[PDB]
Design a protein around this ligand. Structure first.
Ligand SMILES: Nc1ncnc2c1ncn2[C@@H]1O[C@H](COP(=O)(O)OP(=O)(O)OP(=O)(O)O)[C@@H](O)[C@H]1O
Ligand SMILES: Nc1ncnc2c1ncn2[C@@H]1O[C@H](COP(=O)(O)OP(=O)(O)OP(=O)(O)O)[C@@H](O)[C@H]1O
Ligand SMILES: Nc1ncnc2c1ncn2[C@@H]1O[C@H](COP(=O)(O)OP(=O)(O)O)[C@@H](O)[C@H]1O
Ligand SMILES: Nc1ncnc2c1ncn2[C@@H]1O[C@H](COP(=O)(O)O)[C@@H](O)[C@H]1O
Length: 280
């Protein structure tokens, strides 16, 4: 079937920033709009020139190569570094869809190009809209066979964080593996979840505005997972229906559920991208 992606796209206007928008302001925008994904456009002609997600912020904070903007150019000063324009840490060469793109293209793009959301552009590459894996799952939820089970879709080998792990280390794990969410596991048992969004929430805390002005930047990246993880996790289990799990994700704006034992031992993880393999 050939259904236009545009027929689904968030008919809300898309929140954007500009290349000269500071990292600080981009962070606030992410925070204020709850949107953890921001297209970078010209002011301008509205051409998509970049994209910045919470994962890019986690990179910048210590998880990857973008951290050297802080450590090197700005000699460990997180607060001066965030005055840098967003173009310094945004991803360029963006994966986009043409305004005539269809659902199957979007899905293939999500499944093969390891993205969860893509800007929809026209022929001038001006921003029209954006589509996420959630929008597609929401639109096709009642087209999932009610009997289809989650087993085949579960990612068995889970990359994990522990309650004692420092933020600077979990950030490495997230960025290196390209996983925004890590189940938190201790002695084989699920004790929580931590995501890249949590790291962003932390930066906009009173606790963090304190250490920055009178910090002690390092104390932010030294926080252990137990201090900030979500302890009570929406989990899935083998034998659960795929449609049930999918519905739970979409109705809660949650992208990932750790898959657990009745004893809370980790069997796997299932995410929105996995759900979309049903329509592969
Ligand atoms: N459409 C895109 N085109 C190019 N790069 C992108 C795009 N979307 C995200 N990225 C980049 O991918 C890297 C990982 O970010 P993130 O994991 O937040 O995106 P994602 O993989 O699309 O999200 P999700 O885990 O919900 O599927 C970041 O550097 C981000 O800038
Ligand atoms: N399975 C879960 N159970 C309980 N809490 C969760 C679960 N998954 C994520 N969270 C919490 O939800 C909050 C938002 O997480 P996150 O933004 O990474 O979810 P998401 O799938 O990316 O949805 P979105 O991309 O639309 O924001 C975080 O505080 C995270 O700890
Ligand atoms: N923590 C993890 N450990 C192992 N695999 C994971 C983890 N998180 C996600 N995956 C798998 O990686 C693939 C891409 O999923 P994705 O939704 O982009 O991950 P995430 O939401 O954490 O960024 C999926 O098959 C998913 O099950
Ligand atoms: N955008 C960036 N991302 C990562 N590291 C950077 C970035 N900008 C500057 N740096 C680091 O800061 C050092 C000095 O930068 P510069 O003074 O602008 O030439 C560089 O050698 C890099 O190691």
């Amino acid at each position: 079937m050939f259904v236009r992606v545009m027929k689904i796209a968030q008919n809300k206007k898309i929140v954007t920033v500009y290349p000269t928008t500071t990292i600080r302001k981009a962070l606030m925008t992410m925070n204020e709009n709850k949107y953890r994904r921001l297209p970078v456009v010209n002011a301008g002609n509205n051409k998509v020139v970049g994209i910045i997600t919470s994962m890019d912020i986690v990179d910048f904070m210590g998880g990857g190569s973008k951290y050297n903007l802080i450590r090197e150019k700005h000699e460990r000063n997180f607060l001066a570094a965030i005055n840098e324009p967003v173009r310094e840490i945004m991803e360029e060469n963006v994966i986009t869809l043409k305004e005539n793109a269809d659902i199957d293209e979007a899905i293939e793009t999500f499944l093969t190009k390891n993205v969860g959301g893509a800007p929809i552009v026209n022929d001038e590459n001006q921003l029209i809209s954006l589509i996420t894996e959630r929008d597609v799952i929401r639109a096709l939820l009642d087209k999932i066979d009610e009997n289809e089970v989650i087993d085949d879709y579960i990612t068995r080998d889970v990359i994990v964080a522990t309650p004692g792990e420092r933020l600077k280390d979990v950030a490495r794990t997230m960025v290196r593996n390209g996983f925004r969410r890590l189940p938190v596991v201790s002695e084989g048992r699920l004790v929580g979840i931590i995501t890249s969004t949590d790291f962003i929430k932390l930066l906009g805390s009173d606790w963090a505005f304190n250490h920055m002005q009178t910090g002690n930047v390092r104390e932010i990246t030294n926080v252990r997972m137990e201090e900030i993880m979500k302890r009570d996790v929406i989990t899935a289990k083998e034998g659960d229906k795929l449609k049930k799990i999918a519905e739970i994700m979409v109705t809660n704006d949650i992208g990932a559920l750790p898959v657990v034992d009745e004893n809370l031992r980790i069997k796997g993880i299932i995410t929105e991208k996995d759900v979309l393999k049903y329509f592969a």
